[model samples]
Target: GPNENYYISPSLDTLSSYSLLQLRKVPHLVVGHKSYGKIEFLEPVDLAGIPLTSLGGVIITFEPKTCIIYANLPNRPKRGEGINVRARITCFNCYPVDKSTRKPIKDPNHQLVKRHIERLKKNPNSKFESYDADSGTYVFIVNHAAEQT
Candidate 1:
Protein backbone atom coordinates (compact mmCIF):
# COMPACT_ATOMS: atom_id res chain seq x y z
CA GLY A 1 0.00 0.00 0.00
CA PRO A 2 1.14 3.58 -0.74
CA ASN A 3 0.27 6.77 1.11
CA GLU A 4 -0.88 8.23 -2.18
CA ASN A 5 -2.39 11.70 -2.41
CA TYR A 6 -3.66 13.19 -5.65
CA TYR A 7 -4.38 16.77 -6.65
CA ILE A 8 -5.60 17.91 -10.03
CA SER A 9 -5.41 21.47 -11.30
CA PRO A 10 -8.66 23.35 -11.92
CA SER A 11 -7.73 23.67 -15.59
CA LEU A 12 -7.88 19.89 -15.89
CA ASP A 13 -11.55 19.67 -14.95
CA THR A 14 -12.45 18.27 -18.35
CA LEU A 15 -9.99 15.39 -17.93
CA SER A 16 -11.57 12.00 -17.31
CA SER A 17 -10.98 9.75 -14.31
CA TYR A 18 -9.26 7.24 -16.59
CA SER A 19 -6.84 9.91 -17.72
CA LEU A 20 -6.15 10.91 -14.14
CA LEU A 21 -5.46 7.29 -13.26
CA GLN A 22 -3.03 7.04 -16.15
CA LEU A 23 -1.32 10.23 -15.04
CA ARG A 24 -0.92 8.87 -11.54
CA LYS A 25 0.79 5.82 -13.00
CA VAL A 26 3.71 8.02 -13.97
CA PRO A 27 6.60 6.92 -11.72
CA HIS A 28 7.68 10.41 -10.69
CA LEU A 29 4.13 11.53 -9.91
CA VAL A 30 3.97 9.19 -6.94
CA VAL A 31 5.50 10.58 -3.76
CA GLY A 32 6.35 8.46 -0.74
CA HIS A 33 8.39 8.39 2.46
CA LYS A 34 12.10 8.12 2.91
CA SER A 35 13.79 7.37 6.22
CA TYR A 36 12.56 10.76 7.47
CA GLY A 37 8.78 10.83 6.84
CA LYS A 38 5.95 10.94 4.30
CA ILE A 39 4.99 13.87 2.11
CA GLU A 40 2.18 16.08 3.41
CA PHE A 41 0.32 19.22 2.34
CA LEU A 42 2.15 22.50 2.72
CA GLU A 43 0.62 24.39 5.65
CA PRO A 44 -1.13 27.75 5.04
CA VAL A 45 1.44 29.57 7.17
CA ASP A 46 4.20 28.01 5.06
CA LEU A 47 2.47 29.27 1.89
CA ALA A 48 4.06 32.73 2.09
CA GLY A 49 7.52 31.21 1.87
CA ILE A 50 6.51 28.70 -0.84
CA PRO A 51 6.37 30.25 -4.32
CA LEU A 52 3.77 27.76 -5.60
CA THR A 53 1.79 30.42 -7.46
CA SER A 54 4.80 31.23 -9.59
CA LEU A 55 5.61 27.55 -10.02
CA GLY A 56 1.99 26.66 -10.86
CA GLY A 57 0.10 23.34 -10.41
CA VAL A 58 -1.11 21.53 -7.25
CA ILE A 59 1.61 21.43 -4.62
CA ILE A 60 2.43 18.49 -2.37
CA THR A 61 5.37 17.67 -0.14
CA PHE A 62 7.70 14.71 -0.79
CA GLU A 63 10.28 12.61 0.99
CA PRO A 64 12.88 14.55 2.97
CA LYS A 65 10.30 17.38 3.10
CA THR A 66 10.68 18.77 -0.41
CA CYS A 67 7.98 20.54 -2.43
CA ILE A 68 6.53 18.57 -5.34
CA ILE A 69 4.42 20.75 -7.61
CA TYR A 70 2.84 19.31 -10.76
CA ALA A 71 0.49 20.44 -13.54
CA ASN A 72 -0.86 18.81 -16.68
CA LEU A 73 -0.61 20.69 -19.93
CA PRO A 74 -4.01 21.89 -21.07
CA ASN A 75 -3.18 21.07 -24.68
CA ARG A 76 -2.71 17.32 -24.61
CA PRO A 77 -1.98 15.68 -27.92
CA LYS A 78 -5.10 14.50 -29.73
CA ARG A 79 -4.64 10.74 -30.11
CA GLY A 80 -1.14 10.49 -31.59
CA GLU A 81 -0.72 14.23 -32.07
CA GLY A 82 2.26 14.23 -29.71
CA ILE A 83 3.30 12.94 -26.31
CA ASN A 84 1.23 14.05 -23.31
CA VAL A 85 3.43 15.94 -20.93
CA ARG A 86 3.06 16.62 -17.24
CA ALA A 87 5.33 19.37 -16.01
CA ARG A 88 6.76 18.79 -12.57
CA ILE A 89 9.09 20.88 -10.47
CA THR A 90 10.78 20.11 -7.19
CA CYS A 91 11.59 22.77 -4.64
CA PHE A 92 14.34 21.54 -2.36
CA ASN A 93 13.61 22.62 1.20
CA CYS A 94 14.19 19.58 3.39
CA TYR A 95 14.26 20.32 7.11
CA PRO A 96 14.31 17.11 9.10
CA VAL A 97 13.27 17.51 12.73
CA ASP A 98 14.49 15.81 15.85
CA LYS A 99 11.65 13.44 16.83
CA SER A 100 12.12 14.09 20.55
CA THR A 101 12.52 17.90 20.42
CA ARG A 102 10.13 18.45 17.46
CA LYS A 103 12.22 21.49 16.54
CA PRO A 104 13.75 22.27 13.18
CA ILE A 105 17.10 20.58 12.85
CA LYS A 106 19.19 23.35 11.39
CA ASP A 107 22.40 22.25 9.66
CA PRO A 108 21.13 18.69 9.26
CA ASN A 109 23.81 16.25 8.14
CA HIS A 110 21.68 13.55 6.52
CA GLN A 111 23.08 12.05 3.32
CA LEU A 112 20.41 13.65 1.17
CA VAL A 113 20.98 17.00 2.89
CA LYS A 114 24.69 16.38 2.77
CA ARG A 115 24.51 15.94 -1.01
CA HIS A 116 23.40 19.55 -1.47
CA ILE A 117 25.62 20.84 1.33
CA GLU A 118 28.62 19.22 -0.28
CA ARG A 119 27.92 21.13 -3.45
CA LEU A 120 27.76 24.38 -1.49
CA LYS A 121 30.98 23.43 0.25
CA LYS A 122 32.79 23.15 -3.06
CA ASN A 123 31.33 26.25 -4.62
CA PRO A 124 29.33 28.68 -2.53
CA ASN A 125 28.13 30.27 -5.77
CA SER A 126 26.32 27.08 -6.79
CA LYS A 127 22.75 27.71 -7.93
CA PHE A 128 21.41 25.10 -5.45
CA GLU A 129 20.11 27.10 -2.47
CA SER A 130 18.70 26.26 0.99
CA TYR A 131 17.72 28.18 4.14
CA ASP A 132 19.05 29.68 7.36
CA ALA A 133 16.20 28.71 9.75
CA ASP A 134 14.19 31.82 10.78
CA SER A 135 14.03 33.23 7.24
CA GLY A 136 12.53 29.84 6.26
CA THR A 137 13.50 27.47 3.45
CA TYR A 138 15.29 28.73 0.36
CA VAL A 139 14.21 26.88 -2.78
CA PHE A 140 16.48 25.14 -5.26
CA ILE A 141 14.03 24.52 -8.04
CA VAL A 142 14.49 21.44 -10.22
CA ASN A 143 12.29 21.06 -13.29
CA HIS A 144 11.12 17.71 -14.69
CA ALA A 145 9.16 16.71 -17.77
CA ALA A 146 7.11 13.54 -17.29
CA GLU A 147 5.94 12.21 -20.63
CA GLN A 148 3.08 9.74 -21.16
CA THR A 149 3.41 7.21 -23.90
Candidate 2:
Protein backbone atom coordinates (compact mmCIF):
# COMPACT_ATOMS: atom_id res chain seq x y z
CA GLY A 1 0.00 0.00 0.00
CA PRO A 2 1.11 3.57 -0.59
CA ASN A 3 0.57 4.47 3.04
CA GLU A 4 2.75 1.68 4.39
CA ASN A 5 5.62 3.23 6.33
CA TYR A 6 8.52 0.80 6.24
CA TYR A 7 10.11 -1.47 3.67
CA ILE A 8 13.13 -3.75 3.39
CA SER A 9 16.41 -1.98 3.92
CA PRO A 10 19.26 -1.72 1.38
CA SER A 11 20.64 -5.19 2.09
CA LEU A 12 17.38 -6.89 3.13
CA ASP A 13 18.85 -7.31 6.61
CA THR A 14 16.42 -5.00 8.40
CA LEU A 15 13.57 -2.78 7.25
CA SER A 16 14.15 0.55 8.96
CA SER A 17 14.24 4.23 8.16
CA TYR A 18 12.67 7.34 9.72
CA SER A 19 12.44 9.59 6.69
CA LEU A 20 10.99 7.04 4.25
CA LEU A 21 8.16 6.16 6.61
CA GLN A 22 6.95 9.76 6.77
CA LEU A 23 7.30 10.18 3.03
CA ARG A 24 4.96 7.27 2.42
CA LYS A 25 2.32 8.82 4.64
CA VAL A 26 2.42 12.17 2.83
CA PRO A 27 2.50 11.22 -0.88
CA HIS A 28 -0.80 9.35 -0.59
CA LEU A 29 -2.62 12.64 0.09
CA VAL A 30 -2.94 12.84 -3.71
CA VAL A 31 -4.16 9.27 -4.25
CA GLY A 32 -7.65 9.68 -2.78
CA HIS A 33 -8.90 12.07 -5.49
CA LYS A 34 -7.35 13.51 -8.59
CA SER A 35 -8.34 16.99 -7.51
CA TYR A 36 -7.31 16.65 -3.87
CA GLY A 37 -4.60 19.11 -2.80
CA LYS A 38 -1.28 17.43 -2.02
CA ILE A 39 1.61 19.53 -0.82
CA GLU A 40 5.16 18.21 -1.40
CA PHE A 41 7.06 19.52 1.57
CA LEU A 42 10.54 18.71 2.89
CA GLU A 43 10.55 21.00 5.95
CA PRO A 44 8.10 22.01 8.62
CA VAL A 45 6.03 25.05 7.58
CA ASP A 46 7.35 27.59 10.08
CA LEU A 47 6.57 30.68 8.00
CA ALA A 48 2.73 30.72 8.04
CA GLY A 49 0.67 28.04 9.79
CA ILE A 50 -2.43 30.22 10.01
CA PRO A 51 -5.63 28.27 10.60
CA LEU A 52 -7.40 28.38 7.21
CA THR A 53 -11.03 27.61 6.65
CA SER A 54 -12.59 24.84 4.60
CA LEU A 55 -12.23 25.19 0.84
CA GLY A 56 -14.53 23.34 -1.56
CA GLY A 57 -13.29 21.98 -4.90
CA VAL A 58 -9.89 23.61 -4.59
CA ILE A 59 -6.99 22.97 -6.98
CA ILE A 60 -3.49 22.14 -5.66
CA THR A 61 -0.31 23.38 -7.25
CA PHE A 62 3.24 23.12 -5.86
CA GLU A 63 6.34 24.82 -7.16
CA PRO A 64 9.46 22.60 -7.30
CA LYS A 65 11.54 22.83 -4.08
CA THR A 66 9.30 25.58 -2.74
CA CYS A 67 7.45 25.95 0.58
CA ILE A 68 4.55 27.92 -0.95
CA ILE A 69 1.49 25.97 -2.12
CA TYR A 70 -1.03 27.51 -4.54
CA ALA A 71 -4.80 26.96 -4.60
CA ASN A 72 -7.71 28.08 -6.80
CA LEU A 73 -10.88 29.69 -5.51
CA PRO A 74 -14.03 27.64 -6.13
CA ASN A 75 -15.94 29.55 -8.80
CA ARG A 76 -16.21 30.30 -12.49
CA PRO A 77 -14.36 33.53 -13.05
CA LYS A 78 -12.86 34.11 -16.47
CA ARG A 79 -11.92 37.65 -15.61
CA GLY A 80 -11.70 39.72 -12.42
CA GLU A 81 -10.23 38.78 -9.08
CA GLY A 82 -10.93 35.08 -8.58
CA ILE A 83 -10.18 34.66 -4.93
CA ASN A 84 -8.46 31.56 -3.53
CA VAL A 85 -6.87 30.55 -0.26
CA ARG A 86 -3.11 30.78 -0.43
CA ALA A 87 -1.66 28.35 2.08
CA ARG A 88 1.76 27.16 3.21
CA ILE A 89 2.86 23.50 3.34
CA THR A 90 5.32 22.31 5.99
CA CYS A 91 7.38 19.11 6.14
CA PHE A 92 9.79 17.26 8.39
CA ASN A 93 11.57 13.92 7.83
CA CYS A 94 11.09 12.93 11.47
CA TYR A 95 8.75 9.94 12.21
CA PRO A 96 8.19 7.14 14.71
CA VAL A 97 9.60 3.62 14.66
CA ASP A 98 9.19 0.54 16.80
CA LYS A 99 11.98 -0.67 19.04
CA SER A 100 10.44 -4.13 19.43
CA THR A 101 8.77 -5.56 16.30
CA ARG A 102 8.63 -2.47 14.09
CA LYS A 103 4.84 -2.40 14.09
CA PRO A 104 3.19 0.25 11.96
CA ILE A 105 1.94 3.43 13.57
CA LYS A 106 -1.60 4.76 13.29
CA ASP A 107 -3.13 8.21 12.77
CA PRO A 108 0.20 9.61 11.72
CA ASN A 109 -1.43 11.49 8.90
CA HIS A 110 -2.88 14.18 11.16
CA GLN A 111 0.14 14.49 13.46
CA LEU A 112 1.65 17.50 11.71
CA VAL A 113 -1.68 19.10 10.85
CA LYS A 114 -2.86 18.71 14.40
CA ARG A 115 0.19 20.55 15.60
CA HIS A 116 -0.53 23.34 13.11
CA ILE A 117 -4.17 23.68 14.16
CA GLU A 118 -3.22 24.21 17.79
CA ARG A 119 -0.67 26.83 16.81
CA LEU A 120 -3.13 28.58 14.51
CA LYS A 121 -5.74 28.67 17.25
CA LYS A 122 -3.32 30.66 19.39
CA ASN A 123 -2.63 33.34 16.78
CA PRO A 124 -5.51 35.82 16.73
CA ASN A 125 -5.41 37.08 13.15
CA SER A 126 -8.66 38.63 11.97
CA LYS A 127 -7.94 37.66 8.37
CA PHE A 128 -7.10 34.09 9.26
CA GLU A 129 -9.20 31.24 7.94
CA SER A 130 -11.28 29.01 10.22
CA TYR A 131 -9.87 25.48 10.27
CA ASP A 132 -11.18 22.07 11.29
CA ALA A 133 -9.23 19.41 13.14
CA ASP A 134 -11.29 16.51 11.87
CA SER A 135 -10.32 17.11 8.25
CA GLY A 136 -6.62 17.01 9.18
CA THR A 137 -5.99 19.77 6.69
CA TYR A 138 -5.78 23.57 6.89
CA VAL A 139 -4.41 26.48 4.93
CA PHE A 140 -3.41 30.09 5.54
CA ILE A 141 -6.38 31.76 3.91
CA VAL A 142 -5.28 34.72 1.81
CA ASN A 143 -7.18 36.54 -0.94
CA HIS A 144 -4.56 36.30 -3.63
CA ALA A 145 -5.08 37.00 -7.37
CA ALA A 146 -5.81 33.98 -9.55
CA GLU A 147 -6.88 33.31 -13.16
CA GLN A 148 -8.84 30.11 -12.59
CA THR A 149 -11.90 29.68 -10.42
Candidate 3:
Protein backbone atom coordinates (compact mmCIF):
# COMPACT_ATOMS: atom_id res chain seq x y z
CA GLY A 1 0.00 0.00 0.00
CA PRO A 2 1.91 3.05 -1.22
CA ASN A 3 -0.71 5.41 0.16
CA GLU A 4 -1.31 5.73 3.88
CA ASN A 5 -5.08 5.89 3.41
CA TYR A 6 -7.21 4.43 6.16
CA TYR A 7 -9.33 1.34 5.68
CA ILE A 8 -11.73 -0.28 8.13
CA SER A 9 -12.45 -3.95 8.27
CA PRO A 10 -15.19 -5.20 10.58
CA SER A 11 -14.78 -8.30 12.72
CA LEU A 12 -15.72 -11.71 11.37
CA ASP A 13 -18.72 -11.81 13.66
CA THR A 14 -19.96 -8.52 12.28
CA LEU A 15 -19.28 -9.65 8.74
CA SER A 16 -21.29 -12.82 9.21
CA SER A 17 -24.17 -11.06 10.94
CA TYR A 18 -24.43 -8.07 8.61
CA SER A 19 -23.80 -9.75 5.24
CA LEU A 20 -20.69 -7.63 4.81
CA LEU A 21 -19.20 -9.75 2.00
CA GLN A 22 -22.04 -8.68 -0.27
CA LEU A 23 -20.61 -5.17 -0.52
CA ARG A 24 -18.08 -3.96 -3.08
CA LYS A 25 -14.43 -3.28 -2.30
CA VAL A 26 -13.10 0.15 -3.29
CA PRO A 27 -11.86 3.46 -1.93
CA HIS A 28 -14.83 4.94 -0.03
CA LEU A 29 -15.87 7.34 2.70
CA VAL A 30 -18.77 7.39 5.15
CA VAL A 31 -20.76 10.22 6.68
CA GLY A 32 -22.81 9.82 9.84
CA HIS A 33 -25.06 12.21 11.69
CA LYS A 34 -25.71 12.02 15.44
CA SER A 35 -29.26 13.41 15.33
CA TYR A 36 -30.31 11.22 12.41
CA GLY A 37 -28.16 8.39 13.66
CA LYS A 38 -27.67 7.07 10.12
CA ILE A 39 -24.53 6.43 8.08
CA GLU A 40 -24.12 7.68 4.51
CA PHE A 41 -21.43 6.49 2.09
CA LEU A 42 -20.06 9.21 -0.08
CA GLU A 43 -18.51 9.30 -3.57
CA PRO A 44 -15.14 7.69 -4.24
CA VAL A 45 -12.19 10.06 -4.13
CA ASP A 46 -9.45 10.16 -6.73
CA LEU A 47 -6.09 8.89 -5.44
CA ALA A 48 -4.02 10.77 -8.03
CA GLY A 49 -2.07 12.91 -5.60
CA ILE A 50 -2.49 10.42 -2.81
CA PRO A 51 -1.31 6.87 -3.52
CA LEU A 52 -4.27 4.55 -3.15
CA THR A 53 -4.50 1.07 -4.64
CA SER A 54 -8.12 0.27 -3.85
CA LEU A 55 -10.91 0.57 -1.32
CA GLY A 56 -12.91 -1.85 0.81
CA GLY A 57 -16.58 -1.72 1.73
CA VAL A 58 -18.15 -0.26 4.88
CA ILE A 59 -20.54 -1.32 7.67
CA ILE A 60 -22.68 0.90 9.86
CA THR A 61 -25.06 0.41 12.77
CA PHE A 62 -28.09 2.63 12.34
CA GLU A 63 -29.97 4.19 15.22
CA PRO A 64 -33.54 3.24 16.10
CA LYS A 65 -35.02 6.02 13.91
CA THR A 66 -33.15 7.30 10.87
CA CYS A 67 -32.28 7.08 7.18
CA ILE A 68 -29.02 6.57 5.24
CA ILE A 69 -27.44 6.51 1.79
CA TYR A 70 -25.06 3.93 0.27
CA ALA A 71 -23.07 4.82 -2.85
CA ASN A 72 -20.94 2.79 -5.26
CA LEU A 73 -18.52 4.00 -7.88
CA PRO A 74 -18.16 2.89 -11.47
CA ASN A 75 -15.82 -0.02 -11.97
CA ARG A 76 -13.62 1.63 -14.56
CA PRO A 77 -12.05 5.07 -14.65
CA LYS A 78 -13.32 7.92 -16.77
CA ARG A 79 -12.03 8.54 -20.32
CA GLY A 80 -9.09 10.76 -19.46
CA GLU A 81 -9.44 12.11 -15.93
CA GLY A 82 -10.67 10.04 -12.97
CA ILE A 83 -13.15 7.46 -11.78
CA ASN A 84 -16.90 7.81 -11.98
CA VAL A 85 -18.72 7.39 -8.73
CA ARG A 86 -22.47 6.96 -8.40
CA ALA A 87 -24.58 7.37 -5.28
CA ARG A 88 -27.58 5.42 -4.10
CA ILE A 89 -29.64 6.43 -1.12
CA THR A 90 -31.63 4.01 0.94
CA CYS A 91 -33.64 4.99 4.01
CA PHE A 92 -33.84 2.68 6.97
CA ASN A 93 -37.01 1.91 8.90
CA CYS A 94 -37.18 3.69 12.27
CA TYR A 95 -39.45 2.73 15.13
CA PRO A 96 -41.04 4.58 17.98
CA VAL A 97 -40.67 3.92 21.72
CA ASP A 98 -43.49 3.31 24.13
CA LYS A 99 -43.95 6.32 26.30
CA SER A 100 -45.46 4.55 29.28
CA THR A 101 -43.03 1.67 29.23
CA ARG A 102 -40.12 3.91 28.20
CA LYS A 103 -39.08 1.10 25.84
CA PRO A 104 -39.89 -0.28 22.46
CA ILE A 105 -43.06 -2.32 22.37
CA LYS A 106 -42.48 -6.03 22.11
CA ASP A 107 -43.45 -7.58 18.77
CA PRO A 108 -43.63 -4.10 17.28
CA ASN A 109 -43.27 -5.32 13.74
CA HIS A 110 -46.48 -7.29 13.94
CA GLN A 111 -49.37 -5.24 12.62
CA LEU A 112 -51.88 -7.33 14.54
CA VAL A 113 -50.40 -6.17 17.82
CA LYS A 114 -52.41 -3.37 19.41
CA ARG A 115 -49.29 -1.64 20.71
CA HIS A 116 -47.57 -1.24 17.38
CA ILE A 117 -44.32 0.63 16.80
CA GLU A 118 -44.18 3.93 14.92
CA ARG A 119 -42.16 4.52 11.75
CA LEU A 120 -39.66 7.35 11.43
CA LYS A 121 -39.46 7.63 7.67
CA LYS A 122 -40.01 10.83 5.78
CA ASN A 123 -43.57 12.06 5.61
CA PRO A 124 -45.40 13.08 2.45
CA ASN A 125 -44.35 16.66 2.98
CA SER A 126 -40.74 15.84 3.77
CA LYS A 127 -37.98 15.86 1.18
CA PHE A 128 -34.52 14.31 0.88
CA GLU A 129 -31.64 16.38 -0.48
CA SER A 130 -28.18 15.80 -1.92
CA TYR A 131 -24.90 17.38 -0.88
CA ASP A 132 -21.24 17.58 -1.80
CA ALA A 133 -19.14 14.80 -0.25
CA ASP A 134 -15.87 16.67 -0.37
CA SER A 135 -17.40 19.60 1.50
CA GLY A 136 -18.24 18.23 4.94
CA THR A 137 -19.02 15.30 7.19
CA TYR A 138 -22.52 13.88 7.61
CA VAL A 139 -23.06 15.54 11.00
CA PHE A 140 -21.97 18.90 9.72
CA ILE A 141 -24.10 18.62 6.59
CA VAL A 142 -27.21 17.46 8.44
CA ASN A 143 -27.02 20.42 10.81
CA HIS A 144 -26.05 23.01 8.23
CA ALA A 145 -29.52 24.47 7.74
CA ALA A 146 -31.87 22.40 9.88
CA GLU A 147 -33.21 23.26 13.31
CA GLN A 148 -32.44 20.86 16.14
CA THR A 149 -35.34 19.68 18.18
Candidate 4:
Protein backbone atom coordinates (compact mmCIF):
# COMPACT_ATOMS: atom_id res chain seq x y z
CA GLY A 1 0.00 0.00 0.00
CA PRO A 2 1.08 3.56 -0.56
CA ASN A 3 2.70 4.96 2.55
CA GLU A 4 0.57 7.18 4.77
CA ASN A 5 3.57 9.04 6.10
CA TYR A 6 4.31 10.35 2.63
CA TYR A 7 0.89 11.92 2.47
CA ILE A 8 0.99 13.07 6.08
CA SER A 9 3.54 15.79 5.47
CA PRO A 10 2.25 19.34 5.83
CA SER A 11 3.61 20.58 2.52
CA LEU A 12 2.62 17.57 0.42
CA ASP A 13 -0.95 17.69 1.75
CA THR A 14 -1.41 20.88 -0.24
CA LEU A 15 -1.20 18.84 -3.44
CA SER A 16 -3.26 15.85 -2.26
CA SER A 17 -6.08 16.55 -4.70
CA TYR A 18 -3.92 15.94 -7.76
CA SER A 19 -3.06 12.30 -7.07
CA LEU A 20 -4.32 10.89 -10.37
CA LEU A 21 -2.71 13.67 -12.32
CA GLN A 22 0.55 12.92 -10.63
CA LEU A 23 0.35 9.09 -10.90
CA ARG A 24 0.28 9.28 -14.68
CA LYS A 25 3.88 10.44 -14.64
CA VAL A 26 5.08 7.80 -12.18
CA PRO A 27 7.39 5.52 -14.12
CA HIS A 28 6.28 1.90 -14.37
CA LEU A 29 9.69 0.39 -13.98
CA VAL A 30 8.68 -3.04 -12.66
CA VAL A 31 5.83 -5.30 -13.64
CA GLY A 32 3.37 -7.68 -11.94
CA HIS A 33 1.31 -7.43 -8.71
CA LYS A 34 2.25 -10.23 -6.29
CA SER A 35 1.54 -9.28 -2.69
CA TYR A 36 -1.53 -9.23 -0.45
CA GLY A 37 -3.19 -11.44 -3.07
CA LYS A 38 -6.74 -11.44 -1.75
CA ILE A 39 -6.39 -8.50 0.60
CA GLU A 40 -7.25 -5.09 -0.73
CA PHE A 41 -7.72 -1.77 1.08
CA LEU A 42 -5.51 0.16 3.44
CA GLU A 43 -6.74 0.52 6.99
CA PRO A 44 -7.03 4.04 8.34
CA VAL A 45 -4.24 4.94 10.74
CA ASP A 46 -3.25 8.02 12.68
CA LEU A 47 0.34 9.13 13.20
CA ALA A 48 0.33 7.03 16.35
CA GLY A 49 -1.27 3.97 14.63
CA ILE A 50 -4.74 4.74 16.05
CA PRO A 51 -7.76 3.99 13.92
CA LEU A 52 -8.89 7.23 12.31
CA THR A 53 -10.80 6.16 9.18
CA SER A 54 -10.60 3.70 6.36
CA LEU A 55 -8.25 5.05 3.75
CA GLY A 56 -8.83 3.56 0.27
CA GLY A 57 -8.59 0.46 -1.90
CA VAL A 58 -5.19 -0.91 -2.83
CA ILE A 59 -4.55 -3.53 -5.54
CA ILE A 60 -2.16 -6.30 -4.44
CA THR A 61 -0.99 -9.31 -6.45
CA PHE A 62 0.56 -12.58 -5.37
CA GLU A 63 2.15 -15.21 -7.62
CA PRO A 64 1.68 -18.67 -6.18
CA LYS A 65 4.48 -20.11 -8.28
CA THR A 66 7.17 -17.82 -7.02
CA CYS A 67 5.25 -16.51 -4.04
CA ILE A 68 6.13 -13.03 -5.21
CA ILE A 69 3.92 -10.02 -4.57
CA TYR A 70 3.77 -6.60 -6.17
CA ALA A 71 1.55 -3.73 -5.12
CA ASN A 72 0.59 -0.44 -6.77
CA LEU A 73 -2.24 2.06 -6.98
CA PRO A 74 -5.04 1.15 -9.34
CA ASN A 75 -5.13 3.66 -12.16
CA ARG A 76 -7.85 6.29 -11.64
CA PRO A 77 -8.64 9.97 -11.70
CA LYS A 78 -8.74 12.32 -8.75
CA ARG A 79 -12.00 12.35 -6.76
CA GLY A 80 -11.48 15.67 -4.99
CA GLU A 81 -8.58 17.70 -3.56
CA GLY A 82 -6.73 16.64 -0.43
CA ILE A 83 -5.00 13.53 0.97
CA ASN A 84 -5.78 10.90 -1.65
CA VAL A 85 -5.54 7.49 -0.04
CA ARG A 86 -3.94 5.22 -2.65
CA ALA A 87 -2.99 1.51 -2.72
CA ARG A 88 0.34 0.07 -3.92
CA ILE A 89 1.23 -3.53 -4.85
CA THR A 90 4.19 -5.02 -3.00
CA CYS A 91 6.88 -7.56 -3.87
CA PHE A 92 6.79 -10.73 -1.77
CA ASN A 93 9.20 -13.02 -3.54
CA CYS A 94 12.17 -11.02 -2.37
CA TYR A 95 12.20 -12.56 1.07
CA PRO A 96 14.71 -15.14 2.17
CA VAL A 97 13.90 -18.85 2.26
CA ASP A 98 13.76 -21.27 5.17
CA LYS A 99 16.17 -24.18 5.10
CA SER A 100 13.83 -27.02 6.06
CA THR A 101 10.40 -25.73 5.12
CA ARG A 102 11.60 -24.15 1.86
CA LYS A 103 9.10 -21.38 2.47
CA PRO A 104 9.66 -17.65 2.53
CA ILE A 105 11.57 -16.92 5.71
CA LYS A 106 11.07 -13.20 6.07
CA ASP A 107 7.81 -11.31 5.61
CA PRO A 108 7.73 -9.29 2.42
CA ASN A 109 6.33 -6.25 4.20
CA HIS A 110 9.16 -6.27 6.68
CA GLN A 111 11.86 -6.39 4.03
CA LEU A 112 10.32 -4.69 0.99
CA VAL A 113 7.64 -2.50 2.47
CA LYS A 114 9.83 0.56 2.76
CA ARG A 115 10.20 0.87 -0.99
CA HIS A 116 6.78 2.48 -1.46
CA ILE A 117 7.01 4.52 1.70
CA GLU A 118 10.19 6.19 0.51
CA ARG A 119 8.62 6.76 -2.88
CA LEU A 120 5.54 8.42 -1.39
CA LYS A 121 7.46 10.61 1.02
CA LYS A 122 10.23 11.75 -1.30
CA ASN A 123 7.87 12.01 -4.26
CA PRO A 124 4.12 12.33 -3.81
CA ASN A 125 3.38 13.50 -7.35
CA SER A 126 1.61 11.07 -9.75
CA LYS A 127 -0.30 10.98 -13.03
CA PHE A 128 -2.96 8.26 -13.32
CA GLU A 129 -6.05 7.88 -15.54
CA SER A 130 -9.38 6.28 -14.70
CA TYR A 131 -9.55 2.64 -15.80
CA ASP A 132 -13.11 3.33 -16.93
CA ALA A 133 -15.88 5.89 -16.80
CA ASP A 134 -18.21 5.85 -13.79
CA SER A 135 -16.11 3.09 -12.27
CA GLY A 136 -14.69 3.33 -8.77
CA THR A 137 -12.84 0.02 -9.00
CA TYR A 138 -9.73 1.94 -9.93
CA VAL A 139 -10.29 5.49 -8.77
CA PHE A 140 -8.40 8.06 -6.77
CA ILE A 141 -9.58 9.11 -3.31
CA VAL A 142 -8.49 12.63 -2.42
CA ASN A 143 -8.96 14.10 1.04
CA HIS A 144 -7.93 17.68 1.50
CA ALA A 145 -5.47 18.14 4.34
CA ALA A 146 -6.91 21.50 5.36
CA GLU A 147 -10.09 19.63 6.32
CA GLN A 148 -9.95 15.86 6.78
CA THR A 149 -13.48 15.24 5.55
Task: Give me the candidate number with maximum lDDT.
Answer: 1
Encode model 2's per-residue lDDT on 47-106: one tens digit a residue.
121112233222233332223333433434444323233433422322243445775534
> What tens-digit string does per-residue lDDT give for candidate 4 at 1-149?
34322222112233233355343222222223323221123322122221112333232224633322222333222442121334433323333455557756444334433443445455445323232222112222232222234
Q: What lDDT does candidate 2 reach at residue 12?
A: 16
Residue-by-residue lDDT tens digits, candidate 3, 8-111: 32322332333322233333544334343334344443333322223333423334354422233334334433333233333323234456667663443433
* CA lDDT for candidate 4: 0.31
Q: Whole-model Cα lDDT per candidate?
A: 0.37, 0.34, 0.33, 0.31
RMSD of each: 13.3, 17.4, 14.5, 16.9
RMSD of model 3, in Å? 14.5
Q: After best superposition, candidate 3 residue 56: deviation in angstroms?
A: 20
What's the residue-level lDDT of 96 in candidate 3? 42
Models 1 onward score TM values of: 0.25, 0.25, 0.24, 0.18
Better of 1 and 4 by lDDT: 1
Q: For residues 43-105, could you state the per-residue lDDT of candidate 1 as single tens digits?
A: 111122333344454444344553423444433434332222233223334555556567666
Tell me the RMSD of model 4 versus the true structure.
16.9
In model 2, which regions exceed 4 Å deviation? 1-115, 122-126, 144-149
In model 3, which runs have C-alpha deviations exceeding 4 angstroms? Answer: 1-42, 49-93, 100-103, 106-149
